[PDB]
């Protein structure tokens, strides 16, 4: 035997979110007490000069952007739990995420906080110039 896919560093934080009625606050309240961020997230050697958009089915990125694997940033999918949306379908699974390169280290964090805008297709407030 059986193939293994996790490091001993992620043992504690994955165990916390597994038993959690509020997985959102649970992870947020881990980083709150300075727990180290979730590690070994899939990453993409993106050509890095491309159309900047929130989530994309094809790899793309800008100078200010960093492209990630989709199923890796869903804390739910990463922790193997149910998705609190309807249709029970993760939206992230199926696309590439483009994080702004400043908070690029903890990618699971960002998706928990800000969502996409459906007027231009950018993460609202981080370049979604709908001034």
């Amino acid at each position: 035997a059986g193939n293994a896919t996790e490091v001993p560093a992620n043992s504690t934080v994955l165990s916390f979110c597994a038993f959690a009625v509020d997985a959102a606050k649970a992870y947020k309240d881990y980083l709150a007490s300075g727990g180290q961020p979730i590690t070994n997230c899939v990453k993409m050697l993106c050509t890095h000069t491309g159309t900047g958009q929130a989530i994309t089915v094809t790899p793309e990125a800008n100078m200010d952007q960093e492209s990630f694997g989709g199923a890796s940033c869903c804390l739910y999918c990463r922790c193997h739990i149910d998705h609190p949306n309807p249709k029970g379908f993760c939206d992230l699974k199926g696309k590439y995420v483009q994080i702004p390169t400043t908070c690029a280290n903890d990618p699971v964090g960002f998706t928990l906080k800000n969502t996409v805008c459906t007027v231009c297709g950018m993460w609202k407030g981080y370049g979604c110039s709908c001034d």
């Binding site: 896919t5 996790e6 070994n40 899939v42 694997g69 989709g70 999918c77 590439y96």
Partner: peptide
């Protein structure tokens, strides 16, 4: 790449 949890599951 998608539908993969971690660096090792790819």
């Amino acid at each position: 790449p998608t539908q993969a949890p971690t660096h090792l599951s790819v």
